[PDB]
Amino acid sequence: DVLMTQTPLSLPVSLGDQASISCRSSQTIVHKNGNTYLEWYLQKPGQSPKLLIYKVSNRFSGVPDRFSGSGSGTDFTLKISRVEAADLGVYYCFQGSHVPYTFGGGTKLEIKRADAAPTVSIFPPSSEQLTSGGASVVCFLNNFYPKDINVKWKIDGSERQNGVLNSWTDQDSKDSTYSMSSTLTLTKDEYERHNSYTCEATHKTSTSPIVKSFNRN
Amino acid sequence: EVQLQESGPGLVQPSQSLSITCTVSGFSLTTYGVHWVRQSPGKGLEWLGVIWSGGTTEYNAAFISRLSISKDNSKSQVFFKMNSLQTNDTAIYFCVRMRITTDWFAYWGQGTLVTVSAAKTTPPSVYPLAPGSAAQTNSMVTLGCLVKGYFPEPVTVTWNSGSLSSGVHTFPAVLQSDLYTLSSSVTVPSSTWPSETVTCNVAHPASSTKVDKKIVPR
Numbered sequence A: 001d002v003l004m005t006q007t008p009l010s011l012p013v014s015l016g017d018q019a020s021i022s023c024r025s026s027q028t029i030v031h032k033n034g035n036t037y038l039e040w041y042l043q044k045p046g047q048s049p050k051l052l053i054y055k056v057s058n059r060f061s062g063v064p065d066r067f068s069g070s071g072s073g074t075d076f077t078l079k080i081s082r083v084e085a086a087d088l089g090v091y092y093c094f095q096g097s098h099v100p101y102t103f104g105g106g107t108k109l110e111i112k113r114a115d116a117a118p119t120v121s122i123f124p125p126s127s128e129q130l131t132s133g134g135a136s137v138v139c140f141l142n143n144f145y146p147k148d149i150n151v152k153w154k155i156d157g158s159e160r161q162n163g164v165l166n167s168w169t170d171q172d173s174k175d176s177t178y179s180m181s182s183t184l185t186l187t188k189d190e191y192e193r194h195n196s197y198t199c200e201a202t203h204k205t206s207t208s209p210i211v212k213s214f215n216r217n
Numbered sequence B: 001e002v003q004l005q006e007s008g009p010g011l012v013q014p015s016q017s018l019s020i021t022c023t024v025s026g027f028s029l030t031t032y033g034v035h036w037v038r039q040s041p042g043k044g045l046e047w048l049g050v051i052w053s054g055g056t057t058e059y060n061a062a063f064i065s066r067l068s069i070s071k072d073n074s075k076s077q078v079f080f081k082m083n084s085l086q087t088n089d090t091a092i093y094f095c096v097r098m099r100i101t102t103d104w105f106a107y108w109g110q111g112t113l114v115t116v117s118a119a120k121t122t123p124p125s126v127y128p129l130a131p132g133s134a135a136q137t138n139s140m141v142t143l144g145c146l147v148k149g150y151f152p153e154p155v156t157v158t159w160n161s162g163s164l165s166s167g168v169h170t171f172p173a174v175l176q177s178d179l180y181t182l183s184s185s186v187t188v189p190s191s192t193w194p195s196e197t198v199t200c201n202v203a204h205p206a207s208s209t210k211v212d213k214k215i216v217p218r
């Protein structure tokens, strides 16, 4: 079957800079009817893919001029001019010339932008959760760059190294920034053992950690 | 006015079969071919097959022995059947119009996440992450929804039915023992926060759960 090889897997680009994504078919992809069915798709996280370019170099309706396709027989390129936060996601090429039709592996766009210090927000467990005998204490670290960050939890002045569930979004479609959620999963009974809860964010921007805390009573 | 609506199960037992109906509106099946694609973290995007306008079907050879695509032209419906499902057939299944020449009916369905498992369906519990003043920095306030203890994937979370799209962060699901948890956050101005109501809309289609949770100050 025709193999489509996309390179690179991940593509660093500066905000405002041109991106160039490569896709290589293992052999030629001209359909019997003469058309070259090379299509480029963009998939944002949580959403379905959407067509950008079809028949190698034709823009789909609603697609800005900033996107263009080119290439020849086995070697195809997507070019994005003036890369923007809205262009974030995974890019895929697709060949529909020879059955079985096949997709490339995907190219994730990584935008390069200025540093941003995280916002920190902390959230006691809700009464509705407590009612059922659980107690998730959640802290969001929002809108930072670059991606590397440390989070420290403190419970009545004693640090909680362990049992912290951390999850990360992909770059934000508005400002090309990252966000992280950090959760302490406790029981209602274990949560009420303590009074003070604190979430501390250490990020290269600042030598001082950014701090939020609450008290149960 | 172009739509590809998909209905099918979240959960299917190992070795049983999968049936998914794609309902088209906007174009006619006597004029256009419809494809089926799946997405899985293992093998990325895989093209499975196509039923062309005249009723001819072609299939990906790797699945040809267990796969069946048919349709009803008058109902605008395309049917996907896969037999003998195994654990790594877990994926999002899409009906799609793609590989276009002349027309402009390029569209993907919402997808049906099919989980191949013997486990049973559990809806989420939806808890508000009500800010308090410890959830504010500068002029902005960050709000949240915790969606806890559900199976199978997916849940979808919007804020204000999708009208609030800027500043929305939806964190990927993670497995705690045998149930999924996820959170979502929205950041808004502190000016909006006395007067405005902010709502998170959680849907778990495997269990027909549709919950609107009002987030308010602490």
Ligand SMILES: N[C@H]1[C@@H](OP(=O)(O)O)O[C@H](CO[C@@H]2O[C@H](CO[C@]3(C(=O)O)C[C@@H](O[C@]4(C(=O)O)C[C@@H](O)[C@@H](O)[C@@H]([C@H](O)CO[C@]5(C(=O)O)C[C@@H](O)[C@@H](O)[C@@H]([C@H](O)CO)O5)O4)[C@@H](O)[C@@H]([C@H](O)CO)O3)[C@@H](OP(=O)(O)O)[C@H](O)[C@H]2N)[C@@H](O)[C@@H]1O
Binding pocket: A033, B031, B032, B033, B034, B052, B053, B054, B055, B056, B057, B099, B100, B101, B102, B103
């Ligand atoms: N030289 C070719 C030529 O010979 P003829 O002189 O005998 O015409 O055409 C032969 C096919 O004969 C026609 O068959 C159609 C029925 O077509 C299909 C079916 O719909 O079931 C599909 C056929 O598949 C092909 C093809 O072989 O021609 C290849 C596919 O890759 C695909 O590209 C399809 C269609 O063109 C796809 O159509 C769409 C699309 O879905 O994207 C939709 C259209 O609106 C249009 O937009 C086109 C684009 O322009 C791109 O082409 O795309 O074609 C094939 O599987 C045949 C099967 O062999 C027949 O048993 O079934 C008949 O149409 P209907 O009368 O409406 O039933 C028509 O009568 C025939 N002439 C081809 O085999 C020769 O090589």
Ligand SMILES: *[C@@H]1O[C@H](CO)[C@@H](O)[C@H](O)[C@H]1NC(C)=O
Binding pocket: B040, B042, B043, B088, B089
């Ligand atoms: C699923 O497992 C089979 C072996 O039973 C393997 O050959 C096939 O390629 C796998 N498919 C995916 C999508 O991982």
